[model samples]
Target: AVGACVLCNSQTSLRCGACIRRPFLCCKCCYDHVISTSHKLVLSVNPYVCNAPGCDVTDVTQLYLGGMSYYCKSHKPPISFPLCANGQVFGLYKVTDFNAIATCDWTNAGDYILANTCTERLKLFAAETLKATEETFKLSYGIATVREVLSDRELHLSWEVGKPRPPLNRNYVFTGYQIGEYTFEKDAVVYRGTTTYKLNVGDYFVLTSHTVMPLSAPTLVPQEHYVRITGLYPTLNISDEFSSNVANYQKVGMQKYSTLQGPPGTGKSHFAIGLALYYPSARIVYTACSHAAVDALCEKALKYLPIDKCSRIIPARARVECFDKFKVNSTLEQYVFCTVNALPETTADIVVFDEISMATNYDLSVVNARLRAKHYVYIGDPAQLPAPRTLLTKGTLEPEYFNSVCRLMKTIGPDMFLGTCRRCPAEIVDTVSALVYDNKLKAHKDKSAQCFKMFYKGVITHDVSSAINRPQIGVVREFLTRNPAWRKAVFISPYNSQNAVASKILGLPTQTVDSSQGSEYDYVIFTQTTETAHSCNVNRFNVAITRAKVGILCIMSDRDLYDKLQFTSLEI
Candidate 1:
């Protein structure tokens, strides 16, 4: 027997000999006495790989020995290498004496040994095939969503996408996955589809799907869609600072003129009363484009402030004829606040015009006539211009007539612009602000983004059996529905004959243009035909448009005529 211990190269102890019969004894001896020879052999062996077939030899060499397999010269066999048989490579079949090395193949008949086993070969082939398939069939998808609001002049589109897809030259098919639905006021067409869509004004759409391809290019038709206001009415509610400033006149006797500009619900009329409330015993004259507007202002004032406080200020004690007319005292000795016509000839300490933008030459002449007042406060928004019908036909003046008043004020000195809005949503007010004045008011600088809740309570029904058949009647019926508690309602007609016609149709009393001039109502309905081509009647139209406290509704025979007026009633 070869008695030398191969692990330690020791010859003195039989217990430490490599040819020891006990495997555990041999292992312990090798571990204890393997300082020189065994250590050298262990370092050269690269124990991570036992020359096993189908194993990552290179990875084992690099990971365990910290070197490349090809560079390991000490582990190379010195003798002539055995020739591989049965088309097997020598490297794949090699085995060592320790039995740690795995045999590539073994046969019971002792036939020629194969270098690669069937199972090992199959695993390698399958792995390579899987890698190739992954390179060929792998893919990813992307999507986007968009929203658009349609108007008369142009279609505006807003969009956002999920994971962005890399730009591709190939055209991608997109479908709309609607999450909500919207209906057009003019047309009742239903749009159905997926991630892609083409839209126009007067078309309704509903979102149906959730996940789909992203919107590539959203399209809006009639590219010229525009939003226009057909009707508006002013309400009272001025800011405390504005009231204080106006009341400053009462304290120091310093005269001042202030102008409030915005759409109907912007609080122009409200601010007038607020100013009066801030200064007790302060004489303030409330006026409007017509006597109806003034009457509405007086009514709103009576609701906010007591009758005695307002009644004590106005020298000419005009009767407090309004919804709660008896609640206010009309006698000169009992009342302080008064509502009057825009007659320039009247004398008052402070004069305010509600919805002043609707003023015509006649109205302005009244303002010009009242130049004797210590202070002049004009309240109105040009953006809510009531169809320049009078100005357009009579060649009276542009709806921007108030611009002249503003210019005159600037020429004289400095002025105040109220910034906050109490009624309209921040967004609606902002939208109206942008549309009407290009957001020129310094007062709207700090308002946060908000969506305004529109007030729409009236309804119009098509019933032949009903007494009201015309569109004007439909509008009036809807107006009455919105305010059932309202005791007084005013119907403004373009001609005396139209007023008579309305009275006969509705069985309600109708007032002539001059008679209805100075009075107001909880509701006012304006009826006009697009076919009529005349100028003087335009003022009559203006008169009807400006009267109303809580609401105003206009009914026109021709849809094109209403469209031309750019006034769309709030959808109920």
Candidate 2:
């Protein structure tokens, strides 16, 4: 017997394909019903059995959780289904041979591959590259494809069915996709696109939906600012060290190469700010591993120096209007703000490198060539995050750790190692010092609280049910909303999923621990989203713990990590 439509009571055979509660809908009202109820699929009732050969048992219940192929309860694929986790409708596909199309651009394999695959491409370059050699371009890579959907009224196959094998690296290839939605209006028409994603190389092929250069020494050039800056340096050939703060600042500015190393919570950036302000006449080129780090230093400069004295050098490709908020506005008069890549050929008297530990050897070479500082000051902590090894070259592939400016600073010992931390509380400092720094860091005796007292533990740990603890995350939001005193607090985690969850509830800027370096807040609410301590390293935990000024609270599913941290366990 035909069923009546749930929308207008019209007789029809179609039902909601997505949910278990099958609601009937007529074909004439399917589009309106989908638009109003946000339902994506509709199907007709039919008998189902296992897709396996010779297993045509109609009595068995069908399952369609991960893959496109429906299987009876008795028969299923041997390996896990739906290799890609982000899109539930996607599966894997294999390419047996490396078919390098003649239209391929040998220099840029990513764009070339997408062009040959009938897709619009993103500006994707190899994050990892072999040294400048012909073999680098010849290496085989993989791509992902999304299947064409039938229509809103029918069951759509979003992914291609294949053996449960893995997909490999380079770029992702998406075919038959419309702008906002995945399907096009026309029945036979299809669109294609590409994106940069990390999929490693493997022999088997699967489907899912989600720079190297030689070094040379650079000559430091002179411009209007450089000429004016050089005039400020002492002409007298006098060199002496003194205990006075004035002499110390003067000596720091006069040095050819100065190094300051310290653990988290120490006054590394504070020293840089002091050096910049002390020498008002000296033109400074402040640089860091990322633009965010440099922007933060600029914010600090705005506090003491006027808008006319400070500027930034942003990237050419970056949108200028995006950085027009708060202290990072680039439109300051007599001040310039741009990226290190876009640094002028002009010279500066002092070039301060913050988070120097994260700059690769090649990065230092680029900075050396672009803008040479008369007095170069390197301030960073090697114990924290090292220069990421995303791209490997023949020169760098051999090193146990990617050669960072830290290696150079360590070879020629730093002039000063900051011991006292003025930012974090005494108890928080002690915990980090014991775990990461081997009891080297100490808190200042008179470190006064700038905001309201926490009244609880300096480092509080809570046990969670799983990696993404929704209940505890919700509690944190409610807690922050009620106690407006800790408004300067930030949420940070190692996992992107965890950060997204908290960001949705808290309605704050999304920040991962890696990006949170060189940033400080009154209080830090950290979420450890790993199931076990063994999955993460000590450096990650170290960085997350020290981002706070007053105190830190850790939410973790694994008590093993807590035991390692030896933090105070509190019931939430």
The whole-model lDDT of each prediction reads 0.37, 0.49
| Model 1 residue 247 CA deviation in Å | 12
Candidate 1 residues lying further than 4 Å off, grouped into runs, are 1-255, 287-291, 304-306, 309-349, 353-374, 381-396, 402-499, 506-528, 531-572
CA shift of 438, model 1, Å: 5.5
Clashes of 1: 40
Candidate 2 lDDT over 269-345, as tens digits, reads: 56666665556667777777676667767766666556666666655444223334333424322334444555666
Summarize candidate 1's per-residue lDDT along 1-572 as a digit string, tens digits. 22333333333222222211211112223333323222211222223233434444322122222123321323434442222122211221111222211111111111111111222222222222222222222223343222443433224333234533322111122333332233210011122232234554333322122221111111100112113211111123544545544432232233344555544344566666765555444455566654356566767776776665443223232222233453343333222333334132445555666665555323344354443455566666544433232112232333333333433333442244445544432433343344444465323323322111222222323222112225555555565666564325566644444554466566555654444543555455555523344312433443443344444455654444344332334454
How does model 2 fare in lDDT? 0.49
lDDT of 2 at 29: 51
Error of 2 at 531 (Å): 5.4
Superposition-based RMSD of candidate 1 using all C-alpha atoms, in angstroms: 34.6
